[PDB]
Amino acid sequence: RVASGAGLPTSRQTTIMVTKYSEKSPITIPFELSAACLTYLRETFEGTI
Amino acid sequence: ANKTLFKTIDEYLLRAKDCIRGDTDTQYVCVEGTEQLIENPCRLTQEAL
Numbered sequence: 001r002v003a004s005g006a007g008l009p010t011s012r013q014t015t016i017m018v019t020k021y022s023e024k025s026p027i028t029i030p031f032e033l034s035a036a037c038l039t040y041l042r043e044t045f046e047g048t049i
Numbered sequence: 050a051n052k053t054l055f056k057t058i059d060e061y062l063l064r065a066k067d068c069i070r071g072d073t074d075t076q077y078v079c080v081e082g083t084e085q086l087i088e089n090p091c092r093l094t095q096e097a098l
Contacts, residue, residue: 008082 050095058093065092 001011050057050065066086068079091097 061093065089 001013004010052060066088068081068084068086070077070079071084
């Protein structure tokens, strides 16, 4: 505030309180595998080349 | 207004001005001290544009 001259009104004291809030935005991406892929990853048989 | 040059310009700076409300659509004359005065060059030369 700034002091005013004679013959003019006076600025009053004022205080302002404000509140902010947050945003939400989850994201998703899937990936997929086949049964043969998992079977050959986990379970080898006969060990040939 | 009829006065000597230095005196007439000195008084032109001080008093020879008006004010207009800024809050309202139509041009009203304000009471003194509420808001700043308005410089009008036409008041000195007493001619329009």
